Amino acid sequence: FPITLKFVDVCYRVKERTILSGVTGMISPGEFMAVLGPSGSGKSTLLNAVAGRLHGSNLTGKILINDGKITKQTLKRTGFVAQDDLLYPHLTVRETLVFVALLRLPRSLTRDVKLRAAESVISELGLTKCENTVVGNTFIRGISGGERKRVSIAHELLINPSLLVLDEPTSGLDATAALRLVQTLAGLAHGKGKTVVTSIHQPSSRVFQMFDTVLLLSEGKCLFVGKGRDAMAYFESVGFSPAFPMNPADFLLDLANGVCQVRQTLVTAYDTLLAITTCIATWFSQLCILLHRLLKERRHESFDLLRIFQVVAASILCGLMWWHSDYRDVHDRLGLLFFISIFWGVLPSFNAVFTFPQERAIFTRERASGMYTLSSYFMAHVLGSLSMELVLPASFLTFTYWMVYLRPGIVPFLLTLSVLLLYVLASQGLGLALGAAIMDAKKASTIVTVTMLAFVLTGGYYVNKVPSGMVWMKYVSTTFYCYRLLVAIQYGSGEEILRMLFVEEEVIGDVGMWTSVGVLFLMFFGYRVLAYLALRRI
Amino acid sequence: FPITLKFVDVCYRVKERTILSGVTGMISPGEFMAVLGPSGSGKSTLLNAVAGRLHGSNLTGKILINDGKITKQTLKRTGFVAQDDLLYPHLTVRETLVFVALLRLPRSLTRDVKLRAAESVISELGLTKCENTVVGNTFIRGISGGERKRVSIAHELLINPSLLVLDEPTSGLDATAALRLVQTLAGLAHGKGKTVVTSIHQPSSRVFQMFDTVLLLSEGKCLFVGKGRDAMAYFESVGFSPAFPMNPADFLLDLANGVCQVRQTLVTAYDTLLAITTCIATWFSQLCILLHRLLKERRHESFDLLRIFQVVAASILCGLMWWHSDYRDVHDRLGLLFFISIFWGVLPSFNAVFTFPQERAIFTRERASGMYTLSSYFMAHVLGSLSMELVLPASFLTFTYWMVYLRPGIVPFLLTLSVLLLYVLASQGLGLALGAAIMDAKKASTIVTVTMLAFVLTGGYYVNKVPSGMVWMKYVSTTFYCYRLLVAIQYGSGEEILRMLFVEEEVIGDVGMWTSVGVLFLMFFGYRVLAYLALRRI
Ligand SMILES: CC1=CC(=O)CC(C)(C)[C@@]1(O)/C=C/C(C)=C\C(=O)O
């Protein structure tokens, strides 16, 4: 319940650099310590010794919680708020925390007690007035910048921690907003008895006064530690004082650099003055939350009105160039089944490469704190993009089948619909597999266009006389199989239009109807087992 | 030479809002006034009465320079630095100002005196240590954030102004950097005798002390105007004083909101206490600078290593699927001239839509201050993208003509090369025309893909039996003419392969060889006169 961080001589290196060189401090419960210092002075590198996320040869020193070397028993009461607010844009403020409660709180609790443990942090972090507004981001009209930091603090206030370690929470806020956000972080130490240690960039006048304890670092030597009242009165005991009306934070940061109307002199004054079946049951609940959580993310990636327009446009071009087409024109119709097969191998695999890059930050953050394990995260993008990446092609083909006059009958329709969707999902798994192998979104959006070019050229339409050494590349192609199958569903084995009439080199093809459905399934599962094995390195 | 801004009762409205409600002040030469206030209190709306860029029914009030109503004779000595540093990323620090000097200083001066009037502002704004480093941006390794504001202040220090009106220059800078940047803005008033009025967001302790005069606005009523020493000593004459060690800017901003341990009380204490051939010669020099200026911008848009890879890839696919192709296979070769014709109508027109959107901020800023006129700006993108958007296609076709075994002979080569480049530039003018009509880069990158889809479908390859009502749309198509011409250059009028053998429906076509070269020229000039008429509204 109480956490007395009692770190001493916290040293640290990096490969040449040294961030911390013997810091020492104590942080008792009910006490609002604030670590101050110049930029690059070693602030964040020491908050990540209170967050316990830096231990090895770099960190040297004994970091203690209640005089005990740190454990994950001691890491269930510590919540480290980082500077990046990683929130999903389309979730309401309440949904954003209702979902994190179910994922974070232990499942032993009921699912109706988890709803109030996530709605009390709303009411006590002052979010009651904006609990039902979209979080948004720069592009989406959302919440204020001061509310987007409270919401990111309610994440770590859901496990009810003891040692709460924020990392520059006020940076980028208003003048009054960054005062209230520290008025609230005082109530967590003065009204709840927590141990809150935060670093602030440039405190205002009222924001420095509300500190109980203060810690100053120049370059990693702990120039001063103690109360906020005893800081400005300590330094003049060596001969330093403001020459003009100052903010006591302003005066103390200047001393951190050595600028007096002195850095090395203020460090030597520290030597002598201030020296079985459930496991498959939790997985299917991590997946049921991760599917309903990021459901509006899979409804903005898919029903963007610049994708509905690029498909309502193709549906009126593709259904006007071929209006009441005739099946006897075997060459006008094999070029329709290759536009349908080009459009839907490029549209899915391209838009599916901006999915893993865009969420590598929210994933690795929320994966390292428990809360899911990449088997339920991967399988919630997979199962969530299947459901949404089939509504545009299913409705393009429903419009481009009765105006184009393709093969009538409910059986040839549902077999063309079935073959499109199985190909829309087999090419989309090419996006997911390249997006995850190359975690860059613009470097991987070019390799999925140089790859759908090698797939469209070798797809069997432009070239009928492929060289003897380039014949294999149509087999690893995904458009070869959707086009072999789209033709065989509208014409067949010839013999019904060879009865009516160049129509045996483009109508009989090379592969069966089942080796074309059995390899558009080995590319469904095969391009997802590679999208996962590529994420097993993050 | 001296500027005594003597504005009085500067009122302002907007449609309901009111930013300023009777401000009054005086700003004499040699005097560093700093206007302070809360966010939205009316700071920037009053700096844009010193920048003279807000006059009409909204602004009401007499704004005076040397007791004279403002003119562009009085607007040649005023330089308004705005918050956005709009610099071209690839220009060196010296080139960025050497180019602005030639465009800004009057051409009566020599071109070697303009070189020193632009290198003295380098030396006296402390840029000598980084004059030969790339400016860069977030993506490009460039200069510091404090040097990127000096460079944007050397722009307005090139016409040698008198009333220099900066707008929040320190916002987003370091702790020490924002001190030096105000140490330098004091030398412009203490070492050069200028009239410098700037608004600062949250001054530090040493940054408030370096103000000569100060102006405080709560919501547009001028709570206080006067020296920096007389501000904290004035308010206690009504009973206000800091209850704890403050920065005097911190204490005064709190009073701006009415927060004392009062807003309306501090305003009433102001009523009674502080109450022919040369014109075508300048144009061809504005164009010679604007071409050498943004030349490295037309070398990053064009030689991006993800465009060299998307064209070195197509050149090895297109030259491996058709390796030693045979001219007797009339259908394998008409599908090669439609890949060449699809690739080069989509690659140029797509990448040419992100040009006018990305520079609508640097253009409108630098156009309103003289310095060019959109006839020389437009004609420097046009003439600058022609030269660079022909190096990739000219070198794709040089590789895909002697491996593919197209029609041998220097005359059929240079006629295919000539027809490609004329089509690469006629489709690129479709990007420029849509990018400028729709100044959004992602909303216009979708209409130039729904348009190159209607152009590729009606290009005469996929459909040979186009409906009776959709036959016109191949004539307004740009791929129809590059494909009609690419075929006629490799086959001709038939008669040489009809001698050797479906090859009269795809080889003779509809349009002549001169109506196909005479409409790929009416789309060069026609898609540029529309890209310009769309920019004549910005
Ligand atoms: C998928 C893709 C990748 C490229 O690099 C070229 C291009 C843009 C043309 C393309 O859309 C390819 C499609 C092609 C060749 C044919 C078509 O569209 O009918």
UniProtKB/Swiss-Prot annotation, chains A, B:
Reactions that this protein is recorded to catalyse: abscisate(in) + ATP + H2O = abscisate(out) + ADP + phosphate + H(+)
Statement: the UniProt record of this protein carries the keyword Ribonucleoprotein: no
Pfam (any one): ABC2_membrane_7
GO biological process: abscisic acid transport; abscisic acid-activated signaling pathway; export from cell; intercellular transport; negative regulation of post-embryonic development; response to abscisic acid; response to cold; response to heat
Keyword tRNA processing: no
Residues that coordinate or bind ATP: 37-44
Disrupted gene: phenotype observed: Hypersensitivity to abscisic acid (ABA).
SMART domains per the UniProt record, alphabetical: AAA
One GO CC annotation: plasma membrane
Main localization (coarse): membrane
Gene3D superfamilies for this protein: P-loop containing nucleotide triphosphate hydrolases (3.40.50.300)
ABC transporter domain span: 16-244
The ABC transmembrane type-2 domain, residue ranges: 285-491
Family, as annotated: Belongs to the ABC transporter superfamily. ABCG family. Eye pigment precursor importer (TC 3.A.1.204) subfamily.
Function of the protein: High affinity abscisic acid (ABA) transporter that mediates the export of ABA, with a preference for (+)-ABA, through the plasma membrane, especially in vascular tissues (e.g. phloem companion cells), and is involved in the intercellular ABA signaling pathway. Together with ABCG31, export ABA from the endosperm to deliver it to the embryo via ABCG30 and ABCG40-mediated import to suppress radicle extension and subsequent embryonic growth.
Protein name per UniProt: ABC transporter G family member 25
Organism: Arabidopsis thaliana (Mouse-ear cress)
